[PDB]
Every structure is written in structure tokens, then in C-alpha cells.
Design an enzyme around this catalytic site. Sequence first.
Site, PDB file in Angstrom:
ATOM      1  N   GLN A  19       3.368  -9.023  -0.884  1.00 33.34           N
ATOM      2  CA  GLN A  19       4.628  -9.082  -0.144  1.00 33.34           C
ATOM      3  C   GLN A  19       5.767  -9.838  -0.830  1.00 33.34           C
ATOM      4  O   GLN A  19       6.925  -9.688  -0.449  1.00 33.34           O
ATOM      5  CB  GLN A  19       4.400  -9.672   1.253  1.00 33.34           C
ATOM      6  CG  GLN A  19       4.092 -11.156   1.271  1.00 33.34           C
ATOM      7  CD  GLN A  19       3.813 -11.685   2.669  1.00 33.34           C
ATOM      8  OE1 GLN A  19       4.477 -12.609   3.139  1.00 33.34           O
ATOM      9  NE2 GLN A  19       2.827 -11.108   3.336  1.00 33.34           N
ATOM     10  N   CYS A  25       4.363  -9.926   6.212  1.00 27.28           N
ATOM     11  CA  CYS A  25       2.928  -9.906   6.479  1.00 27.28           C
ATOM     12  C   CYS A  25       2.597  -9.031   7.691  1.00 27.28           C
ATOM     13  O   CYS A  25       1.632  -8.276   7.668  1.00 27.28           O
ATOM     14  CB  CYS A  25       2.410 -11.330   6.715  1.00 27.28           C
ATOM     15  SG  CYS A  25       3.118 -12.168   8.170  1.00 27.28           S
ATOM     16  N   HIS A 164       0.616 -16.148  10.650  1.00 31.65           N
ATOM     17  CA  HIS A 164       0.486 -15.208   9.551  1.00 31.65           C
ATOM     18  C   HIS A 164      -0.279 -13.952   9.965  1.00 31.65           C
ATOM     19  O   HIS A 164      -1.395 -14.031  10.466  1.00 31.65           O
ATOM     20  CB  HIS A 164      -0.195 -15.919   8.374  1.00 31.65           C
ATOM     21  CG  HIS A 164      -0.246 -15.108   7.118  1.00 31.65           C
ATOM     22  ND1 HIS A 164       0.871 -14.518   6.567  1.00 31.65           N
ATOM     23  CD2 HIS A 164      -1.278 -14.799   6.295  1.00 31.65           C
ATOM     24  CE1 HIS A 164       0.530 -13.879   5.462  1.00 31.65           C
ATOM     25  NE2 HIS A 164      -0.768 -14.034   5.273  1.00 31.65           N
ATOM     26  N   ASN A 184      -5.529  -9.854   3.012  1.00 30.59           N
ATOM     27  CA  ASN A 184      -4.247 -10.548   3.044  1.00 30.59           C
ATOM     28  C   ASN A 184      -3.226  -9.695   2.292  1.00 30.59           C
ATOM     29  O   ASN A 184      -3.582  -8.652   1.737  1.00 30.59           O
ATOM     30  CB  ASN A 184      -4.394 -11.921   2.377  1.00 30.59           C
ATOM     31  CG  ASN A 184      -3.205 -12.832   2.636  1.00 30.59           C
ATOM     32  OD1 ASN A 184      -2.363 -12.549   3.484  1.00 30.59           O
ATOM     33  ND2 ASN A 184      -3.142 -13.941   1.908  1.00 30.59           N
TER      34      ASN A 184
HETATM   35  C1  LIG Z   1       4.416 -13.231   7.407  1.00 25.43           C
HETATM   36  N1  LIG Z   1       4.834 -12.893   6.255  1.00 25.43           N
HETATM   37  C2  LIG Z   1       5.205 -13.993   8.416  1.00 25.43           C
HETATM   38  N2  LIG Z   1       4.666 -14.167   9.730  1.00 25.43           N
HETATM   39  C3  LIG Z   1       4.946 -13.421  10.790  1.00 25.43           C
HETATM   40  O1  LIG Z   1       5.739 -12.485  10.695  1.00 25.43           O
HETATM   41  C4  LIG Z   1       4.300 -13.682  12.051  1.00 25.43           C
HETATM   42  C5  LIG Z   1       3.030 -12.812  12.251  1.00 25.43           C
HETATM   43  S1  LIG Z   1       2.006 -13.212  13.673  1.00 25.43           S
HETATM   44  O2  LIG Z   1       0.577 -12.548  13.544  1.00 25.43           O
HETATM   45  O3  LIG Z   1       1.877 -14.779  13.839  1.00 25.43           O
HETATM   46  C6  LIG Z   1       2.874 -12.549  15.122  1.00 25.43           C
HETATM   47  C7  LIG Z   1       2.304 -12.970  16.431  1.00 25.43           C
HETATM   48  C8  LIG Z   1       2.621 -14.257  17.012  1.00 25.43           C
HETATM   49  C9  LIG Z   1       2.071 -14.637  18.276  1.00 25.43           C
HETATM   50  C10 LIG Z   1       1.205 -13.736  18.977  1.00 25.43           C
HETATM   51  C11 LIG Z   1       0.883 -12.461  18.413  1.00 25.43           C
HETATM   52  C12 LIG Z   1       1.427 -12.082  17.152  1.00 25.43           C
HETATM   53  N3  LIG Z   1       5.293 -13.480  13.160  1.00 25.43           N
HETATM   54  C13 LIG Z   1       6.366 -14.504  13.407  1.00 25.43           C
HETATM   55  C14 LIG Z   1       7.565 -13.777  13.971  1.00 25.43           C
HETATM   56  C15 LIG Z   1       7.477 -12.903  15.126  1.00 25.43           C
HETATM   57  C16 LIG Z   1       8.643 -12.240  15.632  1.00 25.43           C
HETATM   58  C17 LIG Z   1       9.910 -12.432  14.997  1.00 25.43           C
HETATM   59  O4  LIG Z   1      11.004 -11.812  15.474  1.00 25.43           O
HETATM   60  C18 LIG Z   1      10.014 -13.285  13.858  1.00 25.43           C
HETATM   61  C19 LIG Z   1       8.856 -13.947  13.354  1.00 25.43           C
HETATM   62  C20 LIG Z   1       5.929 -15.716  14.298  1.00 25.43           C
HETATM   63  F1  LIG Z   1       6.956 -16.595  14.526  1.00 25.43           F
HETATM   64  F2  LIG Z   1       5.434 -15.325  15.509  1.00 25.43           F
HETATM   65  F3  LIG Z   1       4.950 -16.436  13.673  1.00 25.43           F
HETATM   66  C21 LIG Z   1       6.608 -14.592   8.122  1.00 25.43           C
HETATM   67  C22 LIG Z   1       5.528 -15.391   7.847  1.00 25.43           C
END
Ligand SMILES: *[C@@H](N)C1(NC(=O)[C@H](CS(=O)(=O)Cc2ccccc2)N[C@@H](c2ccc(O)cc2)C(F)(F)F)CC1
Length: 217
Positions: A19, A25, A164, A184
Site C-alpha cells: 500500500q 489497508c 488496521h 497484510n
Molecule cells: C490502513 N491503511 C488504515 N486503517 C484504516 O483504514 C482503518 C481500518 S479498520 O479495520 O480499523 C475499520 C474499522 C474500525 C472499527 C470497526 C470496524 C472496522 N479504518 C479507520 C478509518 C475508518 C473510516 C474513515 O472514514 C477513516 C478512517 C479507523 F479510524 F477506523 F481506524 C489507515 C490506517
Amino acid sequence: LPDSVDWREKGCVTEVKYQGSCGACWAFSAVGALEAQLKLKTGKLVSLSAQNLVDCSTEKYGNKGCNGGFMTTAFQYIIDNKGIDSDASYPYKAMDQKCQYDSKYRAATCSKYTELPYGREDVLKEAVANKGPVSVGVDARHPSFFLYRSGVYYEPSCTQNVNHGVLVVGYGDLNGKEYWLVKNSWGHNFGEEGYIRMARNKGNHCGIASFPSYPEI
Ligand SMILES: *[C@@H](N)C1(NC(=O)[C@H](CS(=O)(=O)Cc2ccccc2)N[C@@H](c2ccc(O)cc2)C(F)(F)F)CC1
């Protein structure tokens, strides 16, 4: 359920992606999950466009491209959009771009997705065994994660606050230690050639079973 599972043996896992400095991710996790389903339905293994999600599954889906997103809403985008382009036709540039989706490059579709119950590792095991690879969130904020090289990952300081997005492509046990086989998206140089075996049945370690979801075609 079988004691162990490795969807790579069934040719349902594309090669590990990198990535870069773009927080995509969630997009790689989502396409990876769908890639397995596509293989099971059509018999062809094809890398799907993570860039497609980054550029198009945006605001309306609560995602922020290179700044993060959800695997579930990514799935819904594919359902709403009636398709997703192949990685080859819509290559990954590790940056936010204008949406360039084109159905003429469609490589897969999605009809629905399922979110598993919070923290139930046995339920996750069943899904991985009977459905296929599952998108999940893990707490990967700890220095030890980045430095992981082999064996079964166990970090005392891990939490259930996921951040993540990755893909569970199997499970098993290594030397008396149960684990989840995780794909990953930090390139083939991270961990065991892009993969990391994380502690299984150890109190939802690093929140790996906190928010699991998988799509269907
Ligand atoms: C990966 N490169 C990155 N992380 C995320 O995008 C992250 C993925 S997650 O599996 O933690 C999403 C999730 C959180 C809680 C419950 C179920 C799934 N998502 C982040 C994110 C979500 C939404 C938006 O608009 C922005 C960011 C976060 F904040 F939830 F962790 C960037 C590091």
C-alpha cells in the site's frame, strides 16, 4: 470444523500487495476478501482494484481514501456500483484520485456482505472454514507488529481497539500455539512474506475477531 485451513492452498488468495504511504489497508482487505469469492464462483483468480475503492468508495460511504475507510462500506459500494474493476485495469497509485470506474473493466460484483458477531473467535473460525477469507480489523499500533518476522504473534500490550484492516486467510496451530493466518498489505517483505500468524483463542487478541466481515457474489 477442520483443525486447520489455508485458502492459499485452494488458490483463492492473490499475491501480497504494497500500500505504500497511502492508508488503503481497508481497500486491500476488502478486495482480498472478494477475490477469494470470485475464484470460488468463476474459477479465475484475479486481483481487484484497491484504487477503485480509494477513489470511488468515498464520502458517501464514510471513507477517506488514503486516510482510512471501512471494509463493510467498501463492500456496499461494490454492491451499489454493481461492480469493481480489476487491479490491472485500474492500477494502484498509492494516492487519492478522481473516481475513474468503468464497467468495461468490471472484474467482479457483490450481492451482499455479512458482519460477524463481536469478538466470537469460534464464529470467525466457522466463517473462514465454510465461507472463505474474512476481512478484519486488528490493533497494529505496537512496535512489535511492525517488527514481526515469524512464529505466532502475541503482544501483551495489544488491545481490542482496531485500527488496521487486514485479511484472515486461514488458521491452524504452530508448535502448540493456535493462530489466525493474516494477509497484510505492506508488501512481501513484511513478516513471513507479507503474512503474519496472530494468536488465536487468546481473548480476541489485538481485536482480530472484533469486526469481521465477508462478501458474497
Ligand atoms: C490502513 N491503511 C488504515 N486503517 C484504516 O483504514 C482503518 C481500518 S479498520 O479495520 O480499523 C475499520 C474499522 C474500525 C472499527 C470497526 C470496524 C472496522 N479504518 C479507520 C478509518 C475508518 C473510516 C474513515 O472514514 C477513516 C478512517 C479507523 F479510524 F477506523 F481506524 C489507515 C490506517
